[PDB]
Design an enzyme around this catalytic site. Structure first.
Site, PDB file in Angstrom:
ATOM      1  CG  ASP A 162      19.507  41.410  21.919  1.00  0.00           C
ATOM      2  OD1 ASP A 162      20.335  42.188  21.414  1.00  0.00           O
ATOM      3  OD2 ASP A 162      18.735  41.749  22.850  1.00  0.00           O
TER       4      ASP A 162
ATOM      5  CG  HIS B 257      18.482  45.579  22.711  1.00  0.00           C
ATOM      6  ND1 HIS B 257      18.503  44.410  23.435  1.00  0.00           N
ATOM      7  CD2 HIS B 257      18.123  46.547  23.582  1.00  0.00           C
ATOM      8  CE1 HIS B 257      18.211  44.659  24.694  1.00  0.00           C
ATOM      9  NE2 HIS B 257      17.947  45.948  24.805  1.00  0.00           N
TER      10      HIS B 257
ATOM     11  N   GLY C 148      17.790  49.031  31.371  1.00  0.00           N
ATOM     12  CA  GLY C 148      19.018  49.383  32.034  1.00  0.00           C
ATOM     13  C   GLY C 148      19.916  48.210  32.351  1.00  0.00           C
TER      14      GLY C 148
ATOM     15  CB  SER D  85      19.407  45.575  27.947  1.00  0.00           C
ATOM     16  OG  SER D  85      18.008  45.726  28.141  1.00  0.00           O
ATOM     17  N   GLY D  86      21.892  43.566  28.210  1.00  0.00           N
ATOM     18  CA  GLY D  86      23.256  43.261  27.905  1.00  0.00           C
ATOM     19  C   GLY D  86      24.022  42.620  29.040  1.00  0.00           C
TER      20      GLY D  86
ATOM     21  CG  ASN E  50      27.991  54.953  44.106  1.00  0.00           C
ATOM     22  OD1 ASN E  50      27.473  55.476  43.133  1.00  0.00           O
ATOM     23  ND2 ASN E  50      27.854  55.429  45.350  1.00  0.00           N
TER      24      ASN E  50
HETATM   25  O1  LIG Z   1      16.285  52.892  26.247  1.00  0.00           O
HETATM   26  C1  LIG Z   1      14.898  52.786  25.969  1.00  0.00           C
HETATM   27  C2  LIG Z   1      14.499  51.408  25.512  1.00  0.00           C
HETATM   28  O2  LIG Z   1      15.665  50.641  25.324  1.00  0.00           O
HETATM   29  C3  LIG Z   1      15.563  49.387  25.959  1.00  0.00           C
HETATM   30  C4  LIG Z   1      16.121  48.298  25.085  1.00  0.00           C
HETATM   31  O3  LIG Z   1      15.427  48.406  23.881  1.00  0.00           O
HETATM   32  O4  LIG Z   1      16.365  49.288  27.075  1.00  0.00           O
HETATM   33  C5  LIG Z   1      17.618  49.948  26.717  1.00  0.00           C
HETATM   34  O5  LIG Z   1      17.682  51.204  27.375  1.00  0.00           O
HETATM   35  C6  LIG Z   1      18.126  51.254  28.676  1.00  0.00           C
HETATM   36  C7  LIG Z   1      18.744  52.627  28.910  1.00  0.00           C
HETATM   37  O6  LIG Z   1      18.553  53.115  30.221  1.00  0.00           O
HETATM   38  C8  LIG Z   1      19.267  50.304  28.631  1.00  0.00           C
HETATM   39  O7  LIG Z   1      20.060  50.530  29.760  1.00  0.00           O
HETATM   40  C9  LIG Z   1      19.058  48.841  28.488  1.00  0.00           C
HETATM   41  O8  LIG Z   1      20.355  48.303  28.589  1.00  0.00           O
HETATM   42  C10 LIG Z   1      18.634  48.832  27.060  1.00  0.00           C
HETATM   43  O9  LIG Z   1      18.079  47.565  26.783  1.00  0.00           O
HETATM   44  C11 LIG Z   1      14.061  49.227  26.250  1.00  0.00           C
HETATM   45  O10 LIG Z   1      13.963  48.275  27.262  1.00  0.00           O
HETATM   46  C12 LIG Z   1      13.653  50.647  26.523  1.00  0.00           C
HETATM   47  O11 LIG Z   1      12.282  50.791  26.304  1.00  0.00           O
HETATM   48 CA   LIG Z   2      32.220  54.191  40.788  1.00  0.00          CA
END
Ligand SMILES: OC[C@H]1O[C@@](CO)(O[C@H]2O[C@H](CO)[C@@H](O)[C@H](O)[C@H]2O)[C@@H](O)[C@@H]1O
Ligand SMILES: [Ca+2]
Ligand SMILES: OC[C@H]1O[C@@](CO)(O[C@H]2O[C@H](CO)[C@@H](O)[C@H](O)[C@H]2O)[C@@H](O)[C@@H]1O
Length: 223
Positions: free
Chosen positions: A84, A40, A175, A177-178, A54
């Site tokens: 996923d 995703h 953020g 995720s993955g 950082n």
């Molecule tokens: O980005 C919005 C929406 O995406 C989700 C995954 O479906 O989270 C994603 O977005 C974040 C971006 O800042 C990603 O970093 C994270 O890796 C990614 O899963 C939802 O959780 C969110 O509502």
């Molecule tokens: Ca850095």
């Protein structure tokens, strides 16, 4: 990561940041040319950033490498998030050193109660938008299948595990995720989804990496 702590600099050397203009997902380096992440998190252009601590300052240890191939699991379901998982082939191999290293694939699936380390640059407030500069860390256990399914009735497939705390307060988040869930040195989970973040009786749900070892190894060999 909600309720975690700031990781020691470069202490999670397999953690990567996926960047398409800004950080948007995590991943894990599993060999010098391949990263595993969540399907995703797919985008058509991705830059992988290795050796980061950082993400808002150029420190000197980073490697920026564009993705050459992005391969999502053929059975990924964008509605249920079943399967996923996705693989990213780097355009050039990463240089492995003290700050950039690989993580092992699992030799067996993790048992409930195993303690794991989750990491990422995702939200640190459950409802807010407070995205950290410094990599965050969280220790949390694998939960039983029954607890996972009791928390998310009708939503947990055989390719998902819950990791976290039923009383809430500590969890991964948007953020993250993955990114990796590493237990006894092996990658057992990929940050996938959950209801809100750090809510009571809503632990995080993770892709069950042990179900995918053959697919990962076959795909690397073929590409
Ligand atoms: O980005 C919005 C929406 O995406 C989700 C995954 O479906 O989270 C994603 O977005 C974040 C971006 O800042 C990603 O970093 C994270 O890796 C990614 O899963 C939802 O959780 C969110 O509502
Ligand atoms: Ca850095
Ligand atoms: O953001 C996760 C959140 O979505 C819900 C549905 O309201 O679950 C659906 O959406 C997830 C998307 O990330 C799927 O992975 C999940 O399979 C599906 O239930 C909530 O239950 C979940 O907390």
């Amino acid at each position: 990561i909600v309720g975690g702590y700031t990781c020691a600099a470069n202490s999670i050397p397999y953690q990567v940041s996926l960047n398409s203009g800004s950080h948007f997902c995590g991943g894990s380096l599993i060999n010098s040319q391949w990263v595993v992440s969540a399907a995703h998190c797919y985008k058509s252009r991705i830059q992988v950033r290795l050796g980061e601590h950082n993400i808002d300052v150029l420190e000197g240890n980073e490697q920026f490498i564009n993705a050459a191939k992005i391969i999502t699991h053929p059975n990924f379901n964008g509605n249920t998030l079943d399967n996923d998982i996705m693989l990213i082939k780097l355009s050039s191999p990463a240089t492995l050193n003290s700050r950039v290293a690989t993580v092992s694939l699992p030799r067996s699936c993790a048992a409930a109660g195993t303690e794991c380390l989750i990491s990422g640059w995702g939200n640190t407030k459950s409802s807010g938008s407070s995205y950290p500069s410094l990599l965050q860390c969280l220790k949390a256990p694998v939960l039983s299948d029954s607890s996972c399914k009791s928390s998310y009735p009708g939503q947990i497939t055989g390719n998902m595990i819950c990791v976290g705390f039923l009383e809430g307060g500590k969890d991964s988040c948007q953020g993250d995720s993955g990114g990796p869930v590493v237990c006894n040195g092996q990658l057992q989970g990929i940050v996938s989804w959950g209801y809100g973040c750090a809510q009571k009786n809503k632990p995080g749900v993770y892709t069950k990496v042990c179900n995918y070892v053959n697919w990962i190894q076959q795909t690397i060999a073929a590409n």
